[PDB]
């Protein structure tokens, strides 16, 4: 599955920039705390081109699974919200190393439109949103705004041709393009939940 | 005799009657949440009676009572301590997030190596304390939530110390996979946009 196979990746990224060439089911296990008779299912995937000998090709899956996830291809994106969230996602240099390159960010506040949230990069008026994102062809669009605006914003997105949604903000926006949620209150949830049942 | 509901469905009870309560509804059955979550109306009950009478009203079950029930069991009710390691745009930004002490999350120290940030405002109201006190920190004040928003290539190791000081969680926003004692939730950004644009290219 999608998130499955960004895990792996993320760690055969990692494992490729140690310099490992193989690595055991069980290592991956560890790594990514799951099941060893999963993490022979998964890969098996892959089928014998995967491993080498008991363990897997980590250069061989790496190339694979960034084949699948198309890591190849470049992404315009555009930040709605110049505020904390906006402004720390535009000012992550090495996110244009990844692909993924943030060429507008807009805001509704007068005495933020004008400056520059990063290098290169002014904050513009929401009010030509649409207007920006269907003269560039953005594809992804990075919602920073608040939960009230969340949907408005999403909408304002998906009328202007956007292909996918990264909302930061905590509402289930509903559009009809894939949306990605990033909760930061809500992971938080998650990790009292597990929390509360460890000590329990 | 009648057994706590294991956290696993605690959690799935939680999160459906928070979809409730979002679509106004005040009494839901055993058979429609049988039906949200895919158990056996038998079990619905068997898990719910763990509530006694108070988890009940009329002919189902009272959705604020049992949201409310559920998240005190949860934690939700209480109010987390957080420390932020690195105060850079991701330490600042979660610093720096309003409402999140009304979620119940609440930063009481940010730390960081950097002389430069040291002893600066990350926050209005919030110092950057040097991370040599970072053990200190978090025992003496029991410190339950770590927030790791530090360079990847260091990330282990601040892990490590929050786990030796007592840290009962670790929020990770660096793009590495911990190993530590306790609980670790990740947040990569990146990675949501490798997901995202994995879930694009695959509605074509
Ligand atoms: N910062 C965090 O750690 C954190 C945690 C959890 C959730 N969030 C969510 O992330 C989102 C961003 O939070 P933040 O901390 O960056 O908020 P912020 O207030 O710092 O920034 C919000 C920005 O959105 C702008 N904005 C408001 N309405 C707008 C509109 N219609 N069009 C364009 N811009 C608009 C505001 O001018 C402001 O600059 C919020 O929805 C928040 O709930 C953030
Ligand atoms: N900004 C983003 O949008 C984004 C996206 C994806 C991932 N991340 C990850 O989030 C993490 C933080 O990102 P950022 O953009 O805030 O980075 P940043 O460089 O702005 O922040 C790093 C901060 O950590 C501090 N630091 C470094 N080593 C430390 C140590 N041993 N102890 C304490 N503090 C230390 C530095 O002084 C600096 O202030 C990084 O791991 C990054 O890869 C960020």
Same mark, same amino acid.
């Given at each position: 599955?999608?998130? %499955?196979? /960004?895990?792996?990746?993320?760690?055969? #990224?990692? *494992?490729?920039?140690?310099?490992? #060439?193989?690595?055991?089911?069980?290592? *991956?296990?560890?790594?990514?705390?799951? $099941?060893?008779?999963?993490? =022979?299912?998964?890969?098996?995937?892959?089928?014998?081109?995967? $491993? %080498?000998?008991?363990?897997?090709?980590?250069?061989?899956?790496?190339?694979?699974?960034?084949?699948?996830?198309?890591?190849?291809?470049?992404?315009? *994106?555009?930040? /709605?919200?110049?505020?904390?969230?906006? =402004?720390?996602?535009?000012?992550?240099?090495?996110?244009?190393?990844?692909?993924? %390159?943030?060429?507008?960010?807009?805001?509704?506040?007068?005495?933020?439109?004008?400056?520059?949230?990063?290098?290169?990069?002014?904050?513009?008026?929401?009010?030509?949103?649409? $207007?920006? &994102?269907?003269?560039?062809?953005?594809?992804?669009? &990075?919602?920073?705004?608040?939960?009230?605006?969340?949907?408005?914003?999403?909408?304002? *997105?998906? $009328?202007?041709?956007?292909?996918?949604?990264?909302?930061?903000?905590?509402?289930?926006?509903? &559009?009809?393009?894939?949306?990605?949620?990033?909760?930061? +209150?809500?992971?938080? =949830?998650?990790? +009292?939940?597990?929390? &509360?049942? =460890?000590?329990?």
């Amino acid at each position: 599955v999608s998130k %499955r196979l /960004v895990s792996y990746y993320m760690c055969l #990224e990692r *494992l490729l920039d140690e310099g490992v #060439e193989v690595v055991s089911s069980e290592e *991956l296990a560890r790594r990514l705390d799951l $099941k060893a008779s999963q993490i =022979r299912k998964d890969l098996s995937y892959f089928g014998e081109f995967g $491993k %080498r000998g008991v363990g897997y090709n980590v250069e061989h899956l790496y190339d694979a699974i960034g084949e699948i996830l198309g890591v190849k291809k470049e992404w315009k *994106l555009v930040v /709605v919200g110049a505020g904390n969230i906006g =402004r720390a996602v535009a000012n992550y240099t090495v996110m244009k190393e990844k692909g993924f %390159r943030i060429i507008g960010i807009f805001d509704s506040d007068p005495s933020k439109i004008g400056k520059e949230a990063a290098p290169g990069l002014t904050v513009s008026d929401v009010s030509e949103l649409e $207007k920006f &994102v269907e003269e560039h062809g953005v594809e992804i669009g &990075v919602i920073a705004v608040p939960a009230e605006h969340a949907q408005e914003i999403a909408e304002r *997105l998906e $009328k202007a041709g956007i292909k996918g949604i990264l909302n930061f903000a905590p509402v289930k926006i509903k &559009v009809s393009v894939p949306v990605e949620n990033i909760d930061i +209150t809500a992971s938080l =949830r998650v990790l +009292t939940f597990e929390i &509360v049942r =460890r000590n329990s």
